[PDB]
């Protein structure tokens, strides 16, 4: 047993490792989206940079779980990071829809981890999730939903001018 | 009788209370418009912020009537603030048309109060309305009319790209 | 269903709308207290400004619930804002006693909403209440209790000099 | 006829001269109050300075009427400035009550001049009164009413401690 360990259930330790992997998976999917929008035959560079920044955010969130694991006396166990579900992402609307689904998948895993922490009476882990993950998750889901609404308004997928305008006005100039 | 009261007719005192309520009503309608444009399935955030700022303006105008009432020795009497006429506002054009009508309703009430103050020979109340309300009212009506003209030019309600562009270019970046 | 909605119960959505209304109601009551203490025959201007600032605080708290509702994919539904229970507030002690009761009423509604969020296993809503409402509520209740103790010490309601001194020393100079 | 004169009735010219005299009279009354509160057996120096400043304000308002008269092509005609009604002013409450009455007397004369200007269809004179006199008059009446309420609260005339405290807290430190 780790000398620092106190009130940390084996099930929670394992679930933190699984959440670490999921964050890395999400990061990798966002990196794929970045590379797609950077292609010469796609060429939406502000959209590309949006996804690159999100990839970096998810990687940081994975690192936070590593640090958390060690703070509680658990042990980081890594698994393969699976490649993303697609090799090409269609267009800005398809990519944003996939991003929304990914953020909701990550959110569900966070909520499930909170339920486990609650069941095992681990208020430190509950606080960590609530203070570092759950609200930023809701914000990202809202942002992407707002984007999807605007992409539909702009006539995606058919309206190329609409897609061009989204890249200039909806995502930050990079 | 209030020790400060001089040349202040009971009818004007009552009409100031009614105008106070109308300003609060207008504020609440603008707050509803803010919340509508902030919805994930509407997502026109500069339009939303425009209406939020107008809600704040109307609330300040209500407060100015409270202060006025007390300065003249009248007594503030509050009534329920009725909820807005609609729960959802359609789109930017429908909302701006409702805003135009609301501003003209408020303007008519101000003009009617000026007529009453004139009838009761109350130059202080006339000056207050002319100096603090009537010109800013004309400016707001002109602004909203200009917006409606541009929304029609942009092809509202059908043209979603037009609506998107209005939010980026016609209202201030928030 | 809203595309952003996840783990958000209809009961919680409805209760957030009711809490929004209660915050608006509280704001309106504080505005009435402001106007009362601004009367020429009351004339306790620092007390008046204290209540004006609290009215603004409650209005901001209502707006935060609107934003919250939309972030979760719920829909803001507004109702009439009922006028305050009294048209005149007696004196500083009576007003502070009414304020204490109002803050405890709002606190109970927040605690009841937390119980509902707990029952529906909504940790995001629990965190929102704990992080944005519950502690500031306890602070406001403590502040007003402290004031009431001092008003009694100063001989309210009978001791007019005591009431005058409270306005100069206990509430911020406005 | 003055080469600049246009739309300026003889009655209004005469009434402006009478208003000039009344402002000088009011100034002189406030100077008497200053001297009273500066007495070694009264010795309320912030109250004294309040009245001194008001004397200066009224003198400036008289000068503004002189300038106005000449701008319109009327002719300034001066009369004796009558001494104040009292040689001694009792205490802070009695003096403030006399000040309230004086400000309401001046206000009535301003309102009567506005009625005359209205009857003679002189919008320039109406504007001058509304823009330079009527609102500042309402503010001064409200201020003095507020003071009287507080002096009564503080137990004037009997409560000397109350009177002492008013001088320290209600009027500006001089
Ligand atoms: Cl353990
Ligand atoms: Cl334990
Ligand atoms: Cl264990
Ligand atoms: Cl593991
Ligand atoms: Cl894993
Ligand atoms: Cl593996
Ligand atoms: Cl596998
Ligand atoms: Cl996919
Ligand atoms: Cl693919
Ligand atoms: Cl997914
Ligand atoms: Cl889990
Ligand atoms: Cl968070
Ligand atoms: Cl957006
Ligand atoms: Cl957008
Ligand atoms: Cl009257
Ligand atoms: Cl009159
Ligand atoms: Cl009347
Ligand atoms: Cl009324
Ligand atoms: Cl009303
Ligand atoms: Cl009512
Ligand atoms: Cl009704
Ligand atoms: Cl409507
Ligand atoms: Cl509706
Ligand atoms: Cl209307
Ligand atoms: Cl009216
Ligand atoms: Cl104006
Ligand atoms: Cl325009
Ligand atoms: Cl425009
Ligand atoms: Cl849900
Ligand atoms: Cl869940
Ligand atoms: Cl549900
Ligand atoms: Cl509801
Ligand atoms: Cl409600
Ligand atoms: Cl209702
Ligand atoms: Cl009801
Ligand atoms: Cl009550
Ligand atoms: Cl009452
Ligand atoms: Cl209550
Ligand atoms: Cl509830
Ligand atoms: Cl808090
Ligand atoms: Cl205290
Ligand atoms: Cl205190
Ligand atoms: Cl002439
Ligand atoms: Cl003419
Ligand atoms: Cl003439
Ligand atoms: Cl003359
Ligand atoms: Cl004269
Ligand atoms: Cl003479
Ligand atoms: Cl004489
Ligand atoms: Cl006298
Ligand atoms: Cl005398
Ligand atoms: Cl007089
Ligand atoms: Cl006259
Ligand atoms: Cl003025
Ligand atoms: Cl005062
Ligand atoms: Cl005072
Ligand atoms: Mg060891
Ligand atoms: Mg284990
Ligand atoms: Mg494989
Ligand atoms: Mg937080
Ligand atoms: Mg985030
Ligand atoms: Mg995220
Ligand atoms: Mg996240
Ligand atoms: Mg009275
Ligand atoms: Mg009446
Ligand atoms: Mg109704
Ligand atoms: Mg004017
Ligand atoms: Mg103006
Ligand atoms: Mg305006
Ligand atoms: Mg307006
Ligand atoms: Mg207006
Ligand atoms: Mg949908
Ligand atoms: Mg429902
Ligand atoms: Mg009722
Ligand atoms: Mg906190
Ligand atoms: Mg607070
Ligand atoms: Mg509170
Ligand atoms: Mg609170
Ligand atoms: Mg000549
Ligand atoms: Mg003449
Ligand atoms: Mg004489
Ligand atoms: Mg006029
Ligand atoms: Mg003015
Ligand atoms: Mg003045
Ligand atoms: Mg004056
Ligand atoms: Mg004056």
UniProtKB/Swiss-Prot annotation, chains A, B, C, D:
InterPro entries: Ferritin, Ferritin-like, Ferritin-like_diiron, Ferritin-like_SF, Ferritin_CS, Ferritin_DPS_dom. SUPFAM superfamilies: Ferritin-like. It catalyses: 4 Fe(2+) + O2 + 4 H(+) = 4 Fe(3+) + 2 H2O. GO terms for molecular function: ferric iron binding; ferrous iron binding; ferroxidase activity. PROSITE patterns: FERRITIN_1, FERRITIN_2, FERRITIN_LIKE. The keyword Membrane does not apply. Fe cation 2 binds at residues 58, 103, 137, 140. Residues 6-155 form the Ferritin-like diiron domain. One of its GO terms (biological process) is iron ion transport. Fe cation 1 binds at residues 23, 58, 61. Keywords: Iron, Iron storage, Metal-binding, Oxidoreductase. GO terms for cellular component: cytoplasm. Its EC number is 1.16.3.1. Stores iron in a soluble, non-toxic, readily available form. Important for iron homeostasis. Has ferroxidase activity. Iron is taken up in the ferrous form and deposited as ferric hydroxides after oxidation. There are three types of ferritin subunits in amphibia: L, M and H chains. M and H chains are fast mineralizing; the L chain is very slow mineralizing. Belongs to the ferritin family. This is Ferritin, middle subunit. It comes from Aquarana catesbeiana (American bullfrog). The lineage of its organism: Eukaryota, Metazoa, Chordata, Craniata, Vertebrata.
